[PDB]
Amino acid sequence: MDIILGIRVQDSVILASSKAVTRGISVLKDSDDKTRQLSPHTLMSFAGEAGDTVQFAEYIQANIQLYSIREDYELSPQAVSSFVRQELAKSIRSRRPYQVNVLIGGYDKKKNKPELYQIDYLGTKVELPYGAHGYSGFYTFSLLDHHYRPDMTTEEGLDLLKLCVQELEKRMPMDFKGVIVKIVDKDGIRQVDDF
Amino acid sequence: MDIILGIRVQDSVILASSKAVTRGISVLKDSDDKTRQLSPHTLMSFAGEAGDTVQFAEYIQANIQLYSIREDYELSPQAVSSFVRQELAKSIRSRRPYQVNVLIGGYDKKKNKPELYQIDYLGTKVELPYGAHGYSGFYTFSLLDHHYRPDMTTEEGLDLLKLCVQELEKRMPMDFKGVIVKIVDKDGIRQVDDF
Amino acid sequence: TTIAGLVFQDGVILGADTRATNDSVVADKSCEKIHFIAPKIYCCGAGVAADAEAVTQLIGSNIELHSLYTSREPRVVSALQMLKQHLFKYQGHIGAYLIVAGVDPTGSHLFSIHAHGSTDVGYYLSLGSGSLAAMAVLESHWKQDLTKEEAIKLASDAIQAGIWNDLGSGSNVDVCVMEIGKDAEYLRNYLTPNVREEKQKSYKFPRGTTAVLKESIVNICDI
Amino acid sequence: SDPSSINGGIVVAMTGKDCVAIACDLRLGSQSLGVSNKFEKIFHYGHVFLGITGLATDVTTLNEMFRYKTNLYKLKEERAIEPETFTQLVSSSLYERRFGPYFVGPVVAGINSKSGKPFIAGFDLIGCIDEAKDFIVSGTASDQLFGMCESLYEPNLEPEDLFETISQALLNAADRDALSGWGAVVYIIKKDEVVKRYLKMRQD
Amino acid sequence: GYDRALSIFSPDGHIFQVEYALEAVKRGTCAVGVKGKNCVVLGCERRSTLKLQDTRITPSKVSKIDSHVVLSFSGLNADSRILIEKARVEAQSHRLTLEDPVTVEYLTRYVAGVQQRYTQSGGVR
Amino acid sequence: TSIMAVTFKDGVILGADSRTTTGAYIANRVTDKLTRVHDKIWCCRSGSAADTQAIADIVQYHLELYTSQYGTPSTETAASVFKELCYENKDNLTAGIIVAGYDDKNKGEVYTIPLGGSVHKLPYAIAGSGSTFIYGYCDKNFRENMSKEETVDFIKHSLSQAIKWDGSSGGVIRMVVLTAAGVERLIFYPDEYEQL
Amino acid sequence: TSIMAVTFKDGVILGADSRTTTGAYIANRVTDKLTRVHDKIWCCRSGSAADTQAIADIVQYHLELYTSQYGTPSTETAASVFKELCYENKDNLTAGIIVAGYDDKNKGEVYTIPLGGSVHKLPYAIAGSGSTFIYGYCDKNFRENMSKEETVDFIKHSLSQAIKWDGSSGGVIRMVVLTAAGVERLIFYPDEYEQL
Amino acid sequence: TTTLAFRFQGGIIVAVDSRATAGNWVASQTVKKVIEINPFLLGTMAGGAADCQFWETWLGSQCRLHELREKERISVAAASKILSNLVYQYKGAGLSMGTMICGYTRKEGPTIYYVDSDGTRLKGDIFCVGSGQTFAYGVLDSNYKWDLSVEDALYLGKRSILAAAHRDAYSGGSVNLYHVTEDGWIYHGNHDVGELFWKVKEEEGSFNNVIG
Amino acid sequence: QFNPYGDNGGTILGIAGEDFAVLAGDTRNITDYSINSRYEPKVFDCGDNIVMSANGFAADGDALVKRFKNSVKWYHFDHNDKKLSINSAARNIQHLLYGKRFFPYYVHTIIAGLDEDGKGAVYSFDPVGSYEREQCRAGGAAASLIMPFLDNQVNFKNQYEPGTNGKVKKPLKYLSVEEVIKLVRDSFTSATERHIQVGDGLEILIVTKDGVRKEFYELKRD
Amino acid sequence: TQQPIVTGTSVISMKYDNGVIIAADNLGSYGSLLRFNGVERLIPVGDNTVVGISGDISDMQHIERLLKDLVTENAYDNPLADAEEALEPSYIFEYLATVMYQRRSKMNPLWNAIIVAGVQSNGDQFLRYVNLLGVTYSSPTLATGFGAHMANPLLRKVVDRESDIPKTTVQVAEEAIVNAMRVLYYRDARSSRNFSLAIIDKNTGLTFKKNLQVENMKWDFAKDIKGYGTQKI
Ligand SMILES: [Mg+2]
Ligand SMILES: [Mg+2]
Ligand SMILES: [Mg+2]
Ligand SMILES: [Mg+2]
């Protein structure tokens, strides 16, 4: 899969993920949702090798949902990201590694803070104000470095994200067919249906 | 270079060529004209290896312009295409071959007929009602096979071409940044500035 | 690396240089390449430094447990057999080249051991990148019935040849002398021919030279 | 492709009079791309400090592994682990992965709580111990650090002088390495106080 | 190759082969050029010794070198074709490399240079 | 390496050079390639020094355990144990071993085990890199039922030539004589054999 | 291939087997590898048959033209022409040639030219794949100033062993004797030399 | 490496970084990546340092010979094409070049040609070449207008290199600025990225992610 | 396969002062782990108050220096004994190096001298002839060990004035020839300790308006 | 590009107070086969120079012919060919060094390592090395191949730096060279017992010694060595 972006603002985390699924010669789909809800206040977007991405995402989703039922409690975004990192770090020395890069956007209900975690297929974890995987950062980080403020509203975060996507649409060779955008805050997860 | 299309209608030849120039990671330009006027009623569009495409096109242009001045006469489209084919056929067994595919659209003033010639880098020439190079034919030929008629007007040819470009924009992974379209008829060569 | 071993009147002696090099840079200028196996059994290590240390320690541990089990002082042939069988099992993937020497109830012994598990008996041996320089000295001056004072001289001379003429070897000379009816004497930094000269300048900075963004106290104490 | 230079970064450790210093840069990258300017490479287990350079997933993994092991050590021994003992634990743990190693360059620094003796050590990726009196270097600019340390270092520096020496060694080494920099941290460690200082440096 | 020095100095400082080439020009049909304020006109004589000529196909005396420059001549007709051909090639070469058509002065300088070269090259007149 | 074993009237004699090389460097110039697997069953080793030592040590263990249970093994039995190890592990071994032994029933016997792990009983055998140069000499000069002195001369002259032409061979010529009388070691120095 | 040339009291004798192989198939079992470049200057050929024939034909041309201008060439001169071709075209040749000849001044002379294109004047020379097996035998049995009959026996016995052990060698043993008396061809069949 | 050039109302801005690396090792922080072809023409260095230096110095010689022969300033079109035709002859031999040939003449106005070692020659308004090109493009595309002032355009070029110098590991050291006018180029100084970063951070309020 | 290149080790250092220039190099010549020579001169007086060193593959290094010396000789013949200025020498060396663009001299070249205003000058070249005037430049095996130290001690990088805490840089005061030589010696002593290819001896050539002077210093031989 | 076929091993050499010594064994190896036992690898040029050559023997014989042709050519129209305009060691070396570097630059090397030993007109010792790559260097001791690894360490104990040269006599230098040749015979698998040794002295001239043998060899200790570890018989 191609472009996955993340930005943590004042009171929410915004994840933007491309809609295209290309299998070599043809674009098979232009409405693909590259994300799974792990818990009511934690979302994970993903990109990497075909098959492995969804298999990994759904496997993580199942384990976090299992934890939720057992303890009657939602794990913190930090805890979920550490669990995901370990699974990827375990994977890299396997017989056949998961080639999957993820962003984990969550709202910590205890601390009342949005949190964004970037984890690559090796199990390299970093907490960031904004992040990306693959070539997405090469185009967008100069704009984010310039315009980003920690006290941005959700609407300002979306406007900065539009500028990032516009730059991607101008300078990237591949047609990624636009992005699905989702917001993670104190009220949970919702999709911005017009972008 | 990526997409070059050609369609011969009743009284003209229409050539449509992509505007993008990509150098690996970035799209360096989105307004590139992949064509040269060889004579007042003959146009050649081209696609292939970087550098070789323009070098070849301009070399052909110079030779046809030289012929025009020497004889005070415009070579027929057939004659120009045979000259171009021989140069490519000569090229393929060279030390370093021209990797260039061309379409030659011309209006023969003697016969009062439009003519379209498709020539690949090997020197494989074919006269066609419509043609393409690379992957362009894979997407567009099923539409052209269906809708094409030999008695189409120029306006009907342009409408059929819009349908071809729309199909390319839907199913091709690469963003080729739209097409420049040019019409070759009895009055000469002109560019359709809105497409 | 230059390591050497040779026998004398009523003993055996080992020698080694003190330089560790990764690629073309000197990682360590004073490392110990003479490894302890038992109180009177020692091992010079060449090849991959971790492998030579690790294999001597494992066999040294097993030799100690064997010694306790049998109520006998360990033999060099036991260390030799255990090392070669271990190295043979790993088909050279443990890249240890070793010179094993010691004294036991049987007498004094000197063996070499290669990474694939072949062993040799010798009166004088050398291993490592400096072995050819060291062996030139040993072939020139080694004789039968050497005295201890002559043997230490020859062993250090063999290691010095490696130090000066081999870029892989350098720094100081380590020696270990194992004599019959005596405690083994481990002579680390037996020779020190490569002390650095005094520098031209002092590079101590004025205080406040470095720019500092933040200062904080780290809590290392138990809660 | 080379796992030890994908993410980049450096660690240096030095001894002084009744003190040790350990320092590291803050960069994490994906080759040419700078990813994070807050990736600290120094960790501590009680009073023993461990710097780790190399592949960042293994840096994180080994930190979590030694936290695990030093926690269990403490519960069983009823005392905090000492630098000399921890050094052997790092060496053992690395060598047990001899034929599938962690791509890292660990550095140990600390003061023995009973003897008061300053201690530093470095390792290769499979656990070979370098127990230097003077200094230990590690990472993608280890050549540059060797060059700085070998000239700048003198023995028995006081804590506040040692801070200047190790800081200037790290900074100027990092500025000659593409894959290091983006900030830096210096720990000054005495027998019962530890000061942590973030340095100001060029951000390219 | 034939290397013989045909154009050489004589005791009085003249190059007779160059001067005898001017006598060939003197024999050629008259050509005239007149420039106005916003045009140039080239007039040429056609000797009327030759009737039964086919004027459609007979080589015309004025030749286009490019779409903006013309060349007329007096002298040996066959010789003029060689200069016209070289000039036409150079005009297209200039367009190809400089991306601009030749100036009239440049084209003249080129043709004049070709003419000069044949006055101090071995084996040529 | 130049190794051979030769049967004669009173028993068998094993012979070998003493050179071990790593490329062109002589790693050991006084190697003992004549090795004891039982009291009067010895072998000559060629190929990988690690492999042949590992094999010989295992065989010695097998024949020691054989002897504790069933009494003295035959030379054929020793050759069979060698073959079993060489044949079953042919993919991971580079070993060329000549087995020589003395029984009182069978007298002197020689078995050669080349790379493949096949067994060949012979009146005499030659092996190692240097043996190529003496196939002609050995074939022309070997006789059956030679005396001890004739056989010592035959082996001395043969390995002298093998050493002369083969860079991989050299040093001293070691020999081991196996008869009813016992086990005798012999050594011959360069100044002796080079002038032959 | 097994080839040799041996100097003796009255001159020199060249000897060779007659086998030419393409892999394991014997393409020609009656090959003549003893070839004439001048009246009393011959050569033994080993390596690429195409290359050695191409070289020998060129040498024969050079010595014929030499003879027309300067009279009879020496064996040293013939060896030099061979060397010049072999050395200058070493990248594109696989040729191992022994040159043997008789002068009245110099008597019997032998020069060997191995793969590199070096020249070595020797009392006798051996070459070809089968020569490896007789280095020991030839070194032990060669004497200087042998008679014709002794030298024929030496070559016959030597190549007999080379043929016995080398699969690439076989067939008849051809020989060419070069003396003041003239040029004599000899041939020896399998039933003769195999029983030696 | 990060090099850019862009056309605007007041001519051309050319901006480049100063870093050269051999693997991870930073060889130089003081590389001149703008080649001064002559007083009116500039070229940029990317790919092979030697290939760019040598052949753009050589280009200056050909431009000088042209104006001696033709008694007129060489056009940017003709200058760029002399270089592209030269490198095209060497195609396959392993030349490494990515350069912007920049000039301002009467007949053309301000003109930029991207020239490249596989033979490409492109006229354009904005070009960015090097390992940090994508970062520079982001700042350029979002802030570029034709009607920028000379002061604001110079800053935009400076700021775009800074963006790349920060993120790209193989870009940094210092920023060299040029402004190309019809009467010739004007050098606008060497600016250390270390000092520039902190200055820009404070004054602009950007790079909030970085602690200062 | 025949490899036409080799690595003879060595390390060289050029520093440009206010009215002088030094070009220093170790005297050790090596292949793999063997020492070929403990004293093989690597820095050469080329005439016209220019000093040169071409470090790396010693055969290509000798060839280049030999050709440049010859280029100085022919410059005198062709241009009425005119002194070859350091900038002109540099450009000439670019053409010598780029002349073999597709089979390079496998060397890192440095020259030193005085410019036409009498100020110290050092020029640095890559193997194929890209070059630049520089204040400070190490080349060869231990260049990565030396340059960070020189950034810190010559240019005063990362050094600020006490009491200001990062706000005021340490001012870039001019170094004497004696001060530069101390830094050269300490660079090579440190390099010798930590790099196996550096050692034996240090030869420094100093260039002033008065001419070219030589100084030699022992280095550790291990 | 080729590969060496018939090869010669180490050439060793050193300076002493009044001149130079050079030595090399008489073997031409054919891989591991010790094929040719009478090969002279020290080639004198005049009465003041000896060129010692290792590596490919066919290329050595070519170089030998070049040197022979050099002497002929120097004598042409040269009344002082046996006096002031005689060939010097430095002239011979520079010529060979030019040829070696040119040949490597055409990707067709002479596959050799060469040491030119001699004494100049003014009495100065000349000793310099050149190989197939055109790499050159000088030192108080020089050696090729295995000699570099084994002979140099021994010879450097006698002459460790330039100032040791005037303190080293011809007897001490020859002794060191002869011992080094014995060590090489013990340890180099492509060496022979027979060697040649040349001394070039500023007073006594060129002394060329053929058919020398390695003697006083220690082998007796071999009788006591038994098995490879545990064997007692
Ligand atoms: Mg950096
Ligand atoms: Mg950067
Ligand atoms: Mg046969
Ligand atoms: Mg050393």
PDB file of C-alpha atoms in Angstrom, chain D residues 8-136:
ATOM      1  CA  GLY D   8      22.452   6.027  12.631  1.00  0.00           C
ATOM      2  CA  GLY D   9      23.620   7.518  15.926  1.00  0.00           C
ATOM      3  CA  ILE D  10      26.517   7.536  18.388  1.00  0.00           C
ATOM      4  CA  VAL D  11      27.472   6.959  22.014  1.00  0.00           C
ATOM      5  CA  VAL D  12      30.662   7.940  23.839  1.00  0.00           C
ATOM      6  CA  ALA D  13      31.691   7.229  27.456  1.00  0.00           C
ATOM      7  CA  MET D  14      34.627   8.624  29.482  1.00  0.00           C
ATOM      8  CA  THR D  15      36.154   8.247  32.958  1.00  0.00           C
ATOM      9  CA  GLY D  16      37.299  11.079  35.228  1.00  0.00           C
ATOM     10  CA  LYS D  17      38.337  11.628  38.845  1.00  0.00           C
ATOM     11  CA  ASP D  18      35.696   9.857  40.992  1.00  0.00           C
ATOM     12  CA  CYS D  19      33.191  10.112  38.100  1.00  0.00           C
ATOM     13  CA  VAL D  20      32.111   8.800  34.693  1.00  0.00           C
ATOM     14  CA  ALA D  21      30.373  10.484  31.773  1.00  0.00           C
ATOM     15  CA  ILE D  22      28.237   8.936  29.034  1.00  0.00           C
ATOM     16  CA  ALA D  23      26.763  10.848  26.087  1.00  0.00           C
ATOM     17  CA  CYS D  24      24.739  10.263  22.919  1.00  0.00           C
ATOM     18  CA  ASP D  25      23.118  12.032  19.965  1.00  0.00           C
ATOM     19  CA  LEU D  26      19.319  12.108  19.517  1.00  0.00           C
ATOM     20  CA  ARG D  27      18.836  11.261  15.817  1.00  0.00           C
ATOM     21  CA  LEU D  28      16.787   8.367  14.510  1.00  0.00           C
ATOM     22  CA  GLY D  29      16.567   8.046  10.719  1.00  0.00           C
ATOM     23  CA  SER D  30      15.576   5.832   7.823  1.00  0.00           C
ATOM     24  CA  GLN D  31      18.840   6.186   5.879  1.00  0.00           C
ATOM     25  CA  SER D  32      18.734   9.748   4.400  1.00  0.00           C
ATOM     26  CA  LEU D  33      15.390  10.665   6.027  1.00  0.00           C
ATOM     27  CA  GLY D  34      15.525  12.143   9.537  1.00  0.00           C
ATOM     28  CA  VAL D  35      12.613  10.642  11.501  1.00  0.00           C
ATOM     29  CA  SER D  36      13.060  11.629  15.177  1.00  0.00           C
ATOM     30  CA  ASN D  37      15.130  14.183  17.144  1.00  0.00           C
ATOM     31  CA  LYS D  38      14.164  12.701  20.565  1.00  0.00           C
ATOM     32  CA  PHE D  39      15.503   9.126  20.257  1.00  0.00           C
ATOM     33  CA  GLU D  40      17.608   8.781  23.406  1.00  0.00           C
ATOM     34  CA  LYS D  41      20.154   5.955  23.322  1.00  0.00           C
ATOM     35  CA  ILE D  42      21.181   5.945  27.009  1.00  0.00           C
ATOM     36  CA  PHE D  43      19.186   3.953  29.579  1.00  0.00           C
ATOM     37  CA  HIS D  44      19.779   3.134  33.244  1.00  0.00           C
ATOM     38  CA  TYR D  45      19.116   0.203  35.582  1.00  0.00           C
ATOM     39  CA  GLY D  46      19.615   1.546  39.088  1.00  0.00           C
ATOM     40  CA  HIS D  47      23.028   3.268  39.016  1.00  0.00           C
ATOM     41  CA  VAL D  48      24.376   1.374  35.947  1.00  0.00           C
ATOM     42  CA  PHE D  49      24.079   3.262  32.626  1.00  0.00           C
ATOM     43  CA  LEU D  50      23.807   1.559  29.221  1.00  0.00           C
ATOM     44  CA  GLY D  51      24.206   3.369  25.892  1.00  0.00           C
ATOM     45  CA  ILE D  52      23.225   1.444  22.718  1.00  0.00           C
ATOM     46  CA  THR D  53      23.908   2.398  19.073  1.00  0.00           C
ATOM     47  CA  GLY D  54      22.938   0.507  15.914  1.00  0.00           C
ATOM     48  CA  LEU D  55      19.641  -0.877  14.633  1.00  0.00           C
ATOM     49  CA  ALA D  56      16.916   1.002  16.532  1.00  0.00           C
ATOM     50  CA  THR D  57      14.470  -1.907  16.919  1.00  0.00           C
ATOM     51  CA  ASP D  58      17.282  -3.866  18.663  1.00  0.00           C
ATOM     52  CA  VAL D  59      18.207  -0.819  20.791  1.00  0.00           C
ATOM     53  CA  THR D  60      14.615  -0.746  22.100  1.00  0.00           C
ATOM     54  CA  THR D  61      14.456  -4.566  22.404  1.00  0.00           C
ATOM     55  CA  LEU D  62      17.727  -4.816  24.376  1.00  0.00           C
ATOM     56  CA  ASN D  63      16.705  -2.011  26.727  1.00  0.00           C
ATOM     57  CA  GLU D  64      13.476  -3.892  27.489  1.00  0.00           C
ATOM     58  CA  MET D  65      15.505  -7.121  27.885  1.00  0.00           C
ATOM     59  CA  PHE D  66      18.050  -5.677  30.354  1.00  0.00           C
ATOM     60  CA  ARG D  67      15.299  -3.899  32.325  1.00  0.00           C
ATOM     61  CA  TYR D  68      13.613  -7.321  32.604  1.00  0.00           C
ATOM     62  CA  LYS D  69      16.836  -9.055  33.706  1.00  0.00           C
ATOM     63  CA  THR D  70      18.076  -6.384  36.151  1.00  0.00           C
ATOM     64  CA  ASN D  71      14.604  -6.238  37.774  1.00  0.00           C
ATOM     65  CA  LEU D  72      14.681 -10.021  38.398  1.00  0.00           C
ATOM     66  CA  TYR D  73      18.336  -9.754  39.502  1.00  0.00           C
ATOM     67  CA  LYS D  74      17.378  -7.158  42.111  1.00  0.00           C
ATOM     68  CA  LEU D  75      14.398  -9.151  43.475  1.00  0.00           C
ATOM     69  CA  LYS D  76      16.587 -12.268  43.936  1.00  0.00           C
ATOM     70  CA  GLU D  77      19.871 -10.620  45.024  1.00  0.00           C
ATOM     71  CA  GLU D  78      18.161  -7.920  47.188  1.00  0.00           C
ATOM     72  CA  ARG D  79      20.573  -5.297  45.798  1.00  0.00           C
ATOM     73  CA  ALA D  80      21.116  -3.279  42.612  1.00  0.00           C
ATOM     74  CA  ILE D  81      23.410  -4.773  39.956  1.00  0.00           C
ATOM     75  CA  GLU D  82      26.960  -3.350  39.697  1.00  0.00           C
ATOM     76  CA  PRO D  83      28.685  -2.165  36.445  1.00  0.00           C
ATOM     77  CA  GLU D  84      31.208  -5.060  36.373  1.00  0.00           C
ATOM     78  CA  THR D  85      28.486  -7.714  36.789  1.00  0.00           C
ATOM     79  CA  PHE D  86      26.151  -6.005  34.286  1.00  0.00           C
ATOM     80  CA  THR D  87      28.973  -5.920  31.710  1.00  0.00           C
ATOM     81  CA  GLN D  88      29.181  -9.732  31.899  1.00  0.00           C
ATOM     82  CA  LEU D  89      25.370  -9.982  31.606  1.00  0.00           C
ATOM     83  CA  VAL D  90      25.440  -7.845  28.417  1.00  0.00           C
ATOM     84  CA  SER D  91      28.284  -9.972  26.978  1.00  0.00           C
ATOM     85  CA  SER D  92      26.498 -13.269  27.810  1.00  0.00           C
ATOM     86  CA  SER D  93      23.208 -12.043  26.372  1.00  0.00           C
ATOM     87  CA  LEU D  94      24.765 -10.875  23.093  1.00  0.00           C
ATOM     88  CA  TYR D  95      26.850 -14.049  22.598  1.00  0.00           C
ATOM     89  CA  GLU D  96      23.795 -16.333  23.095  1.00  0.00           C
ATOM     90  CA  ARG D  97      22.586 -14.836  19.778  1.00  0.00           C
ATOM     91  CA  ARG D  98      25.990 -15.583  18.147  1.00  0.00           C
ATOM     92  CA  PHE D  99      24.523 -16.778  14.815  1.00  0.00           C
ATOM     93  CA  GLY D 100      21.577 -14.345  14.685  1.00  0.00           C
ATOM     94  CA  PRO D 101      22.928 -11.292  16.501  1.00  0.00           C
ATOM     95  CA  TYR D 102      21.431  -8.014  17.563  1.00  0.00           C
ATOM     96  CA  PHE D 103      23.013  -5.308  15.450  1.00  0.00           C
ATOM     97  CA  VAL D 104      24.158  -3.039  18.194  1.00  0.00           C
ATOM     98  CA  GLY D 105      27.057  -1.293  19.831  1.00  0.00           C
ATOM     99  CA  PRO D 106      26.478  -1.243  23.572  1.00  0.00           C
ATOM    100  CA  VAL D 107      28.377   0.848  26.049  1.00  0.00           C
ATOM    101  CA  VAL D 108      28.300   0.434  29.835  1.00  0.00           C
ATOM    102  CA  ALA D 109      29.113   3.263  32.265  1.00  0.00           C
ATOM    103  CA  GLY D 110      28.822   3.483  36.055  1.00  0.00           C
ATOM    104  CA  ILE D 111      30.458   3.696  39.474  1.00  0.00           C
ATOM    105  CA  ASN D 112      30.806   0.627  41.699  1.00  0.00           C
ATOM    106  CA  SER D 113      28.765   1.500  44.810  1.00  0.00           C
ATOM    107  CA  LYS D 114      31.041  -0.419  47.232  1.00  0.00           C
ATOM    108  CA  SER D 115      34.570   0.412  45.928  1.00  0.00           C
ATOM    109  CA  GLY D 116      33.700   3.841  44.419  1.00  0.00           C
ATOM    110  CA  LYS D 117      35.699   2.959  41.282  1.00  0.00           C
ATOM    111  CA  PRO D 118      34.737   4.526  37.908  1.00  0.00           C
ATOM    112  CA  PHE D 119      33.961   1.880  35.270  1.00  0.00           C
ATOM    113  CA  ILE D 120      33.310   1.925  31.512  1.00  0.00           C
ATOM    114  CA  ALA D 121      33.056  -0.844  28.918  1.00  0.00           C
ATOM    115  CA  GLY D 122      32.207  -1.338  25.232  1.00  0.00           C
ATOM    116  CA  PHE D 123      31.142  -4.355  23.164  1.00  0.00           C
ATOM    117  CA  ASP D 124      30.941  -5.555  19.576  1.00  0.00           C
ATOM    118  CA  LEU D 125      27.577  -6.979  18.342  1.00  0.00           C
ATOM    119  CA  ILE D 126      28.346 -10.535  19.624  1.00  0.00           C
ATOM    120  CA  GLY D 127      29.614  -9.527  23.107  1.00  0.00           C
ATOM    121  CA  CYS D 128      33.416  -9.097  22.986  1.00  0.00           C
ATOM    122  CA  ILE D 129      34.268  -6.867  25.977  1.00  0.00           C
ATOM    123  CA  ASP D 130      36.544  -3.830  25.662  1.00  0.00           C
ATOM    124  CA  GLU D 131      37.178  -2.608  29.245  1.00  0.00           C
ATOM    125  CA  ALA D 132      39.021   0.666  28.678  1.00  0.00           C
ATOM    126  CA  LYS D 133      40.566   2.868  31.369  1.00  0.00           C
ATOM    127  CA  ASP D 134      40.120   6.046  29.285  1.00  0.00           C
ATOM    128  CA  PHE D 135      37.134   6.071  26.862  1.00  0.00           C
ATOM    129  CA  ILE D 136      34.706   3.966  24.802  1.00  0.00           C
TER     130      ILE D 136
END
